[PDB]
């Protein structure tokens, strides 16, 4: 139990194996420890079937230990079962904190070890100046020869992303990684590492950038084991996407390093490329062979690494609590909730109306509109209600959530993590229900306090709401802000929902005109000093942001009339838009639309051999059109038949028509929908 003050840079998963066991298994975890140099230790954990299932979602342990084919050349094992690997890494990161003690990245740490075994048994907090986390650049690019035929995999899975198809093809035919030209450059400055590869199998130094280390462990199993690792020197993580390039580089690294007799690590990676339908956020999780992360602004990446033990975003919602532990905590946090808000949660429907709001279309004229927001209110309520329901559930994931919540105002990266965490913490209906109910009570409190501080809500959600006044003006707006803050605080504390940091209600604008045409479509304007805001207009491409600019100019002038003249201005604005569009009639990416893997175009077979461009498509497909072209799957520049600006302009003009019909009806009462004659005039420009 000798103790040293060291700081782990990465917790990576080295081995997973079963003893003479049926309902549990063990894992060996690799510590990249440092000090004022680096050292390489390991810990032994033990995860039972119930813990695995809790972090999985309910499956067996005999299936998370037969993913010990990952110590081989076949390099894309999580493609078979991504949720299994998410669950295994999260459950090992929970069992480690539960057995050894509180483990945290980049922090000074008192670390123990039993000399007979060599493994870390206990970990405690300590004091000291830790090493400033280092970094190393990584310019990885490779020529994976995947035969277009990627057509098959997308045939079985229609809405699949081509990065996933690329990885599935490599998994099907592994030797495409062992015959692929590759060019890599790692610049830590201590030793520059360029390399040259005709084929990746065929031929500074690899020893000048890493250290090969053999450590003799004797876990509790059948015999003594030798764990060999690559210890980073003078860097803690790569910074850069070509994910097959990284996989092939690390795969030949594994082959060369581990071709001598001693046990081989897991060699497992997770990214949005590994799911069929992709993932909105990019990342490259390294939970296996090499040892250290390869982050794909870098300050936010490093900080999110340190806060959430690097499990995020690979694990997902498992950072905070196991997925099978959410019903218990939700019901517990409902039990400690007032009966009124109990019933409010009990009747939460995503379409039920709580506050009486302005019905689309509406127009509030020359009065002091506001736009109020409780920043990250859903995250705060999730954290507070999770603390309240912790009696139903150990709390280290809650600590991670709490650190994110208390850091969000000062760190935008925490805000981004929360915005990708709360939508997936349950998506698990009980959390939708409880969050909706607590928000319903918050909305009612805003109503009741508004009726006394000279305010009237005219839209919003409860955490982001906007409304009008009954009135110098800056003073009453300040009063309304303070009164509503205190009211939501008091009503939240009544329900025992205790928030980590006191509520702040931000005044996101003091506007003097507002028009609403849909549930989210609202435009605000300030005559006293031009500062508009427009929400609800889609931005699916550059043409859409130019259209948003046009719509905002048009609305400025149309409300500057303070209805036929308004129609004249709107039609002339459309005229100018179409003319300027014809000036950009040839730019392909300008008319491109970004479409998810969930909305409905066919993939042309020629797009299925654009080489390595297919591996940068994890979430969005950016298509021009009447035949659709996936622009990013072709080299540059593009030879193209003249882009069908009629289709794209008709799309954009239908959104503009939504906006304009709403404005015309709201302001003056004209029931006539604004319709642009496109075929009658200006269609000929692209015939």
């Amino acid at each position: 139990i000798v103790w040293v003050e060291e700081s782990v840079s990465a917790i990576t998963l080295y081995a997973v194996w079963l003893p003479p066991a049926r309902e549990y298994f063990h894992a060996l975890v690799y510590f990249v420890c440092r000090n004022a140099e680096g050292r390489a230790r390991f810990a032994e954990v033990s995860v039972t079937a119930t813990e695995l299932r809790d972090f999985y979602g309910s499956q067996a342990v005999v299936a998370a230990a037969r993913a010990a084919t990952t110590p081989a050349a076949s390099p894309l094992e999580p493609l078979e079962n991504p949720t299994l690997w998410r669950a295994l890494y999260a459950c090992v990161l929970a069992a480690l904190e539960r057995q050894t003690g509180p483990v945290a990245l980049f922090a000074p740490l008192r670390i123990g070890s039993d000399p007979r075994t060599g493994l870390v048994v206990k970990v405690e907090r300590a004091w000291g100046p830790p090493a400033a986390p280092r970094a190393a650049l990584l310019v990885a690019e490779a020529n994976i020869d995947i035969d277009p035929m990627l057509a098959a995999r997308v045939a079985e899975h229609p809405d699949a992303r081509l990065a996933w198809a690329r990885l599935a093809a490599i998994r099907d035919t592994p030797q495409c990684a062992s015959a692929a030209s590759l060019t890599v450059n790692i610049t830590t400055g201590t030793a520059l590492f360029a390399r040259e590869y005709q084929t990746l199998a065929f031929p500074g130094a690899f020893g000048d950038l890493v250290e090969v280390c053999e450590v003799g462990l004797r876990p509790r199993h059948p015999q003594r084991v030798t764990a060999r690792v690559l210890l980073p020197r003078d860097y803690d993580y790569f910074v850069s996407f070509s994910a097959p390039a990284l996989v092939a580089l690390f795969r030949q690294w594994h082959t060369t390093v581990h071709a001598a007799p001693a046990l081989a690590p897991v060699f497992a990676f997770l990214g949005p490329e590994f799911e069929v339908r992709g993932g909105p956020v990019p990342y490259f999780a390294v939970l296996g062979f090499p040892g250290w992360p390869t982050f794909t602004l870098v300050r936010g990446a490093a900080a999110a690494y340190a806060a959430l033990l690097g499990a995020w975003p690979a694990v997902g919602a498992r950072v905070v609590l196991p997925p099978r532990a959410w019903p218990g905590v939700a019901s517990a946090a409902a039990g400690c909730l007032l009966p009124a808000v109990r019933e409010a949660v009990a009747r939460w429907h995503p379409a039920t109306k709580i506050i009486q709001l302005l019905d689309p279309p509406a127009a509030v004229g020359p009065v002091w509109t506001a736009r109020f927001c409780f920043p990250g209110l859903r995250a705060q309520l999730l954290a507070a209600l999770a603390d309240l329901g912790g009696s139903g559930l150990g709390r280290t994931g809650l600590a991670r959530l709490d650190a994110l919540v208390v850091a969000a105002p000062s760190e935008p990266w925490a805000g981004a993590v929360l915005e990708r965490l709360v939508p997936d913490t349950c998506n698990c209906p009980a959390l939708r229900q409880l969050l909706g109910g607590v928000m319903a009570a918050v909305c009612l409190q805003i109503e009741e306090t508004a009726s006394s501080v000279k305010f009237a809500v005219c839209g919003g959600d409860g955490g982001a709401f906007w409304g009008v006044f009954n009135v110098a003006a800056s003073g009453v707006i300040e009063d309304a802000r303070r009164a509503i803050e205190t009211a939501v605080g008091a009503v939240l504390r009544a329900n025992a929902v205790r928030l980590r940091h006191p509520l702040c209600l931000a005044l996101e604008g003091v506007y003097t005109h507002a028009v609403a045409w849909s549930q989210a479509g609202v435009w605000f304007w300030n005559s006293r000093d031009n500062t508009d805001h427009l929400g609800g207009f889609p931005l699916r491409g550059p043409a859409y942001t130019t259209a948003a600019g046009v719509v905002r100019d048009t609305l400025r002038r149309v409300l500057g009339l303070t209805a036929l003249t308004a129609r004249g201005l709107m039609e002339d604005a459309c005229d100018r838009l179409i003319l300027d569009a014809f000036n950009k009639r040839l730019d392909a990416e300008y008319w491109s639309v970004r479409v998810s893997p969930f909305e409905a175009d066919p993939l042309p077979p020629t797009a299925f051999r654009g080489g390595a461009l297919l591996d940068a498509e994890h979430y969005w497909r950016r298509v021009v059109r009447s035949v659709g072209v996936p622009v990013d799957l072709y080299p540059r520049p593009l030879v193209l038949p003249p882009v069908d600006c009629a289709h794209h302009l008709r799309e954009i003009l239908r959104e503009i028509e939504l906006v304009f019909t709403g404005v015309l009806a709201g302001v003056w009462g004209e029931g006539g929908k604004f319709v642009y004659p496109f075929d009658d005039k200006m269609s000929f420009l692209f015939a």
Binding site: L579, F582, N583, R585, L586, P604, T606, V627, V629, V631, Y634, P635, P637, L638, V639, L640, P641, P642, D680, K681, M682, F684, L685, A687
Partner: protein, 357 residues
């Protein structure tokens, strides 16, 4: 009258472009500036239907991002790099849009020529009169001057120079009114009677052009109408085929097959109202439908002046404008391609008449 016919039987839609927009529209929707300007030799792709299909196939192999006469007429795009037709043509300095031609061949069979530039000297110098002759001709009456200057006149790589048909492209704007007369006649018509008939055709046609194109200065005195007349001083004529080519007035440009179909219809109603015209053309001609309007659609090909049919070359007849100012200049336009091509470069704001209903 003709005013009543253009009030009750036409619905004109025009859209105004201006500034950079007008220039961009003209550049994109007409032939390239160098296309119809004379050149030493020709660059372009010219072959039979089979060979041209094969080369289009071998040109789409190089067209990886997206993807017989509908396709030749469709290959038009330049950007900031060499145009897309540079793969079929194999010449890397072409500029688009570029002319597309259907080519009758002996003994039968159709070929195509999609080419950027061409020596139009080889085609037109056997009928391009000397400026000394024009000046030295002596003949004060314009009818007489026109009649005498008319009197004086005189593999696919070989067949495009004796037989050539411009293919109409609905994606391209139209800068000339190219009519196609089809004069049936039981009795042969003497040449001076026919020349007077064309001279009275032109003023009715110019009145029609004025009606259709209000914002303009179409003077029925000096507006250039270019008449060509198939041979057969008469052609020993016993159907006569004419060809009237007019500049579309400078501010305007026509778009759409339907639109030029309507334009031809309105000019036919203009000419079959001129009481001084139906005297000359009358008493010889069986029919009276003097213009074929079903020639303007996307894909139909019309023979070009200085070319024969597989053989009456459309050599010009100089129906000289009355009160014309520069006779040598007028004579010097029958040989320029830009006065008798649908989609030529026109010779501020513009107005596109894209609909007549």
């Amino acid at each position: 009258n003709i005013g009543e016919y253009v009030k009750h039987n036409v619905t004109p839609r025009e859209t105004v472009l201006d500034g950079d927009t007008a220039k961009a529209y003209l550049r994109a929707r007409t032939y390239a500036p160098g296309a119809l300007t004379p050149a030493p030799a020709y660059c372009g792709a010219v072959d039979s239907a089979t060979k041209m299909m094969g080369r289009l196939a071998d040109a789409e192999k190089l067209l990886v991002p997206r993807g017989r006469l509908l396709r030749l007429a469709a290959t038009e795009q330049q950007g900031p790099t060499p145009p897309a037709i540079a793969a079929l043509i194999r010449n890397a300095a072409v500029q688009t849009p570029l002319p597309v031609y259907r080519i009758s061949m002996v003994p039968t069979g159709q070929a195509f020529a999609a080419l950027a530039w061409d020596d139009w000297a080889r085609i037109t110098r056997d009928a391009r009169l000397a400026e000394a002759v024009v000046s030295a001709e002596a003949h004060p009456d314009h009818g007489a001057l026109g009649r005498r200057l008319t009197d004086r006149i005189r593999d696919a790589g070989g067949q495009m120079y004796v037989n050539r048909n411009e293919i109409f492209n609905g994606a391209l704007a139209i800068t000339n009114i190219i009519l196609d007369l089809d004069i049936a006649l039981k009795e042969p018509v003497p040449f001076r009677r026919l020349h007077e008939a064309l001279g009275h055709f032109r003023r009715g046609a110019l009145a029609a052009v004025q009606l259709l194109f209000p914002a303009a200065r179409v003077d029925p005195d000096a507006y250039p109408c270019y008449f060509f007349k198939s041979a057969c001083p008469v052609c020993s004529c016993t159907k006569i085929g004419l060809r009237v080519c007019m500049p579309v007035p400078a501010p305007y440009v026509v778009h759409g097959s339907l639109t030029m179909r309507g334009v031809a219809r309105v000019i036919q109603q203009a000419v079959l109202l001129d009481r001084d015209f139906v005297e000359a053309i009358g008493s010889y001609v069986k029919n009276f439908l003097l213009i074929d309007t079903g020639v303007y659609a996307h894909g139909h090909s019309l023979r070009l002046p200085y070319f024969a049919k597989i053989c009456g070359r459309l050599l010009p007849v100089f129906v000289i404008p009355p009160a014309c100012k520069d006779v040598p200049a007028f004579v010097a336009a029958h040989a320029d391609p830009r006065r008798f091509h649908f989609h030529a470069p026109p010779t501020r704001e513009i107005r596109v008449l894209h609909s007549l209903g």
